[PDB]
């Protein structure tokens with residue numbers, strides 16, 4: 001049955017790693033990794049989650065099963081983080097939340113609820129979007145299409161070639177947005193543009209699907225979600241899939257949450273029951289530890305004080321490396337305007353290099369970027385920067 | 397889209413709980429719960445996992461992502477637990493292992509790999525089997541059928557009406573077994589009977605799918621898997637989904653592993669790649685903590701010494717409660733032969749009560765059993781026993 005019938009191929013990020021330690025030169029610089037790094041080139045476990053973990057080791061008197069929808073106050077905290085303190089969605093009880101194994105785990109759960117208990121058959125992702133977006137939605141049974149977003153001659157959003165590509169989307173369609181800012185490009189919709197997309201999706205059909213992974217990483221925990229919250233006020237139906245892995249450092253623990261707003265507490269509760277029936281068929285009930293850590297930090301003003309500080313420290317390092325990269329190019333190799341790296345937001349960005357400049361960097365110069373020209377700027381240590389630019393200036 | 401379109405209904409175990417604390421009488425006795433309880437009626441966190449958890453809090457220097465297939469030595473430990481020390485499957489490299497979010501998480505992963513990368517379209521579960529078996533396999537896209545196993549006039553396996561119902565299964569079919577012993581009934585295939593089913597599945601087609609959750613709970617960590625290991629020697633293709641939640645007390649952490657044997661290391665590796673492609677579309681990468689706990693206990697002879705002791709202590713309590721239940725019936729209410737409770741294995745068993753004896757127990761007498769007459773015997777404290785039997789003797 002499994003004999004010689006089967007296949008391969010490599011989901012493209014993960015293929016880049018093994019090919020790299022492999023280099024000994026040091027194999028000096030790997031950019032493109034999906035995770036943040038500090039001053040030294042390591043991803044530590046936050047001091048704030050570390051404190052909340054001894055608090056747990058001290059207080060857990062049982063490891064018996066979680067309800068399918070997770071921890072109660074974890075839910076109360078994530079909706080309160082997404083929508084605001086007194087957002088009428090919260091009470092009006094228009095929103096319900098299921099703790100999930102990551103952002104990816106929440107995207108499939110949405111896609112499976114949608115796939116069986118609704119009329120959706122197609123879903124639109126940006127161009128480009130996160131690699132895995134396509135196989136999650138496809139896997140559930142849906143189809144995935146592509147609106148235009150950016151292109152790489154002028155280094156920004158085509159707000160005109162975007163709205164004029166989402167007009168081919170019909171009433172029953174899911175449009176996936178990324179709330180904070182965008183993987184790979186790093187490019188911001190302004191609240192005026194969000195304002196716009198918000199109002200097309202009300203008088204147009206379409207169910208919004210926010211993909212929220214870099215909260216707190218562009219401008220600040222409250223500012224970033226103002227997009228999603230611009231949308232959450234026109235709308236009566238919404239699904240946001242959130243991750244707590246990159247801004248909590250909680251990556252291998254698997255923590256995030258699938259939340260749905262749905263017009264009135266009576267319906268968000270019929271719709272959450274089938275949503276819960278889809279978790280039972282999937283993983284059954286969620287992973288307690290890492291979510292338990294996000295719930296007790298966020299519900300502790302001393303620990304949350306310290307975590308928000310670590311969140312402001314992660315963000316400013318990335319913001320410092322964009323200027324240390326843009327102008328060490330400026331100052332070591334004249335060729336072109338790289339400006340755009342600066343105020344673009346988040347860890348990921350598109351350098352503007354050919355597939356053959358990526359291949360020119362990776363096999364003699366050290367620098368490993370993913371074939372799209374997408375570099376993780378958090379992967380730049382202050383010591384990287386002037387050999388980093390070496391290769392990028394030797395290739396133009 | 398979600399508006400008044402949707403539905404309900406309650407997956408039957410979980411419905412029994414809320415309906416119970418609700419009783420104040422104390423609402424004296426809830427049996428049927430899916431988890432073990434001790435002398436006092438609580439589910440504690442094992443002293444051995446508790447030690448391995450401070451060891452972790454001390455040594456984790458990062459929470460960055462796991463590979464899709466989990467922890468290496470966790471894999472090496474679970475195959476070595478399932479097959480033996482020098483089982484030729486292990487090296488001959490005929491077996492590959494993916495760490496998963498629970499036993500349920502591994503059953504869906506199997507079912508999704510199977511559903512897209514194979515010719516299987518139908519899968520046979522026992523009668524009865526675990527409630528959730530049906531919706532996992534259905535959810536992936538497959539169909540689920542029912543062989544006969546037991547019936548409730550003579551309180552055992554119909555080894556004759558079983559083999560003569562699995563003859564309607566064709567070559568490309570998956571037959572799901574439960575390696576240790578059986579949920580609800582508690583009824584053992586003997587190695588002679590396993591021997592048999594082993595040899596039909598070789599000269600008959602059928603892919604074995606072992607569902608391994610109560611290892612160490614019937615007779616002992618090595619003895620229990622001798623069924624699976626009788627099967628693992630005729631066979632060239634196998635899938636076992638294992639859980640570490642009930643015998644490690646690790647329930648809300650979500651730890652188990654989907655392992656496939658598949659004839660030769662070259663093919664188990666083409667077949668594991670598509671298996672890995674299905675995890676990426678599902679949860680992406682697994683929950684580190686609880687699996688990390690199972691890997692460091694099992695790879696530490698001091699900690700494993702203590703864990704195996706806790707496993708022998710959980711098992712003997714259940715074995716003591718079967719005799720304290722069977723003969724406190726004997727000694728407080730003469731009506732019938734309840735013998736069979738004794739040597740039947742595991743936590744769960746079928747009392748032999750009508751739906752209307754379950755309803756006679758639950759709303760005036762205290763005792764809460766699930767409508768099938770399935771009682772969790774681990775749910776009996778030594779103090780329960782003579783009011784427990786009260787109700788069961790008042791109903792015959």
Ligand SMILES: *Cc1c(COP(=O)(O)O)cnc(C)c1O
Pocket residue numbers: 101102103104105130178183211213243244245246255256679680
């Ligand atoms: C990281 C990320 C995700 C989710 O990943 P998890 O590891 O499951 O949290 C989803 N969407 C985008 C855009 C991401 O960057």
Ligand SMILES: *Cc1c(COP(=O)(O)O)cnc(C)c1O
Pocket residue numbers: 283284497498499500501526574579607609639640641642651652
């Ligand atoms: C408990 C159990 C499972 C799995 O449950 P998890 O909580 O996912 O470990 C699977 N099969 C049977 C028969 C079970 O009893």
